[PDB]
Amino acid sequence: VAPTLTARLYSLLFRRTSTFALTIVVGALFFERAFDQGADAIYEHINEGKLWKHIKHKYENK
């Protein structure tokens, strides 16, 4: 039997205070970069042809 990630991760990170805090400080970076991107479509995928991002393709670069 092998320790589930938690047993590992706790021994890995949450135990040592910084280490615990460290990945916490890490996670948000990629997160928001991933988060900001992934959500926008959900907004945008719903909003289609009503915005020059879609509209101005009619007249953009002439």
Partner: protein, 241 residues
């Protein structure tokens, strides 16, 4: 003491929560102002900065801006300008002055329409109806000559002669121009006016929501985690008695 009518609520491109504006009609409805409302009612508050939001290419509306302006500039080097240059500029007012404005419309004072939506009760359908409705004077009524009978007007008589008929104009697209369409194509325009951020601002709405459902159960977990002890109490009265 008129029964105050209320406009039936219409669906809209923006009506729903996440429902956005569509600039295609917005572009068109502009021309209307560029055609019609520049007659009297002004809008003072927006620069030519619209460009790409109403889809106008930087050049497109700039060159479009260029023609709009053009006044004096030679008073002993003290000026304003012809030909606006940049986008910061606003529209020329068809009247310099309420005196000049009102007399021209003969006692009527055309309002500036910039925020007027937020002024009037009942959103856009107020106007779209007010656009639509013109009725035949009932038997037993008369009007001031300029006043034209619509129950939508509060006193139900308005000096505004109905502007909109089918094909008042030709759209920028070339879409066949229709009283209702010409009317309805504008109704998105001012809806945009008072809130340029409207389209943009909704983003935060979806942004915050999924952000929001995160933490509360999380918090809700933590709290309980502490309270887990208190609600777990036991008591024992074991008096030496």
């Amino acid at each position: 003491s008129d029964l105050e009518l209320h406009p039936p609520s219409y669906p809209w491109s923006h009506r729903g929560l996440l429902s956005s504006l569509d600039h295609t009609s917005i572009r068109r409805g502009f021309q209307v102002y560029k055609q019609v409302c520049s007659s009297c009612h002004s809008m003072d508050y927006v620069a030519y900065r619209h460009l790409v939001g109403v889809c106008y290419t930087e050049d497109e509306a700039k060159a479009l801006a260029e023609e709009v302006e053009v006044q004096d500039g030679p008073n002993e080097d003290g000026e304003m300008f012809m030909r606006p240059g940049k986008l910061s500029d606003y529209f020329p007012k068809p009247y310099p002055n309420p005196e000049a404005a009102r007399a021209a419309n003969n006692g009527a004072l055309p309002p500036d329409l910039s925020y007027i939506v937020r002024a009037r009760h009942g959103g856009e359908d107020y106007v779209f109806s007010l656009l639509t409705g013109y009725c035949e004077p009932p038997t037993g009524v008369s009007l001031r000559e300029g006043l034209y009978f619509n129950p939508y007007f509060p006193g139900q008589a308005i000096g505004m002669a109905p502007p909109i008929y089918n094909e008042v104009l030709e759209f920028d697209d070339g879409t066949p121009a229709t009283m209702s369409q010409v009317a309805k194509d504008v109704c998105t325009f001012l809806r945009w006016a008072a809130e340029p951020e409207h389209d943009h601002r909704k983003r935060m709405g979806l942004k915050m929501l999924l952000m929001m459902g995160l933490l509360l159960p999380l918090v809700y977990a933590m709290k309980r985690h502490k309270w887990s002890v208190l609600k777990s109490r036991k008591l024992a009265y074991r008096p030496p008695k």
